[PDB]
């Protein structure tokens, strides 16, 4: 707080020190910038919370940040730096990175590959883990938007706004799953909120279609993941066993690469 720490090491600087490369998200959990230290170039995040902003969006934006500031520890969800407090805003620094899955899937126009979506579900799984675990912390808004990748391969979950403290984080993966496997958001053709409720409860789990060269593996895992029934459905401990994790742990997966071509379409 006034000054950040990068690579362990501690720099003094202000929020006069950065230049301000515009938008990248916001709305839910306030504006995100892209911003650039005027004498170097490099490039970070940050988060602007405004003193006059609106109440509810301030309260999420301090949650997430709580969040990540306990979660330093953690290489699966993204590093904070430090923040600097003016009068009138907050300014969190972050570490940046290249978009969201969300993206990824538009530019694409269609399916993202399963060895793709194997890093990603190793990192989101251990992100989940760790925030439960280490901090007693679920999620409750897992989804593409939320996931985030760079150009060096790395994948993180972010945005814990409304994070509570004390089941379906694992049933938001497996529909992020099968959307990004599929190109097609399973409850695509909802109207209403309600609507996308009654279908999870009265229709059978949208698994993955058999037809398309999916794994029995990654098949299982979002079975497993699509498991109605809570006294069903795996702990993080026992997923992080499952032979899907298990093979894309260990697994060379050039996602880096991938991810450039896509951002090049």
């Known amino acids: 707080t006034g000054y950040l720490t990068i690579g362990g090491q501690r720099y003094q600087a202000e929020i006069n020190d950065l230049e301000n490369l515009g938008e990248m998200g916001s709305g839910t959990c306030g504006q995100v910038w892209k911003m650039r230290f005027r004498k ?11 003193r006059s902003g609106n109440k509810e969006e301030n309260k999420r934006i301090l949650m997430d940040l ?13 590093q904070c730096f430090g923040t600097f407090i003016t009068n009138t805003d907050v300014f969190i620094a972050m570490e940046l990175m290249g978009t969201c899955a969300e993206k990824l899937k538009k530019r694409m126009q269609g399916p ?5 979506l194997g890093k990603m579900t190793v990192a989101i799984v251990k992100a989940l883990y760790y925030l439960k675990e280490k901090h007693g912390v679920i999620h409750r808004d897992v989804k593409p938007s939320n996931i985030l990748l760079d150009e060096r391969g790395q994948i993180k979950l972010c945005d814990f706004g409304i994070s ?30 309600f609507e996308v409720l009654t279908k999870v409860l ?20 979002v079975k497993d993941c699509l498991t109605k ?22 697994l060379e997966v050039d996602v880096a690469s991938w991810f450039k071509d896509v951002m090049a379409k």
């Not at 170097?40 to 405004?50: C, D, L, N, P, S």
């Not at 709580?66 to 993204?78: A, E, F, M, T, W």
């Not at 993202?112 to 793709?116: A, G, S």
């Open 202 to 221: 009265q229709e059978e789990p949208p698994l993955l279609p058999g037809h398309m060269g999916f794994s029995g593996d990654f098949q299982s895992f």
């Open 40 to 50: 170097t170039g490099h490039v970070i995040a940050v988060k602007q919370m405004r």
């Open 164 to 193: 509570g403290r004390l089941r379906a984080d694992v049933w938001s993966l497996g529909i992020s799953l099968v959307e990004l496997a599929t190109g097609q958001f399973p409850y695509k053709n909802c109207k209403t909120d």
């Open 229 to 250: 029934d809570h006294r069903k459905r795996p702990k993080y401990n026992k997923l992080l066993e499952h032979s899907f994790i298990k093979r894309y742990e260990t």
């Open 112 to 116: 993202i590959p399963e060895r793709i």
């Open 66 to 78: 709580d969040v990540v500031l306990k979660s330093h520890d953690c290489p699966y969800i993204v």
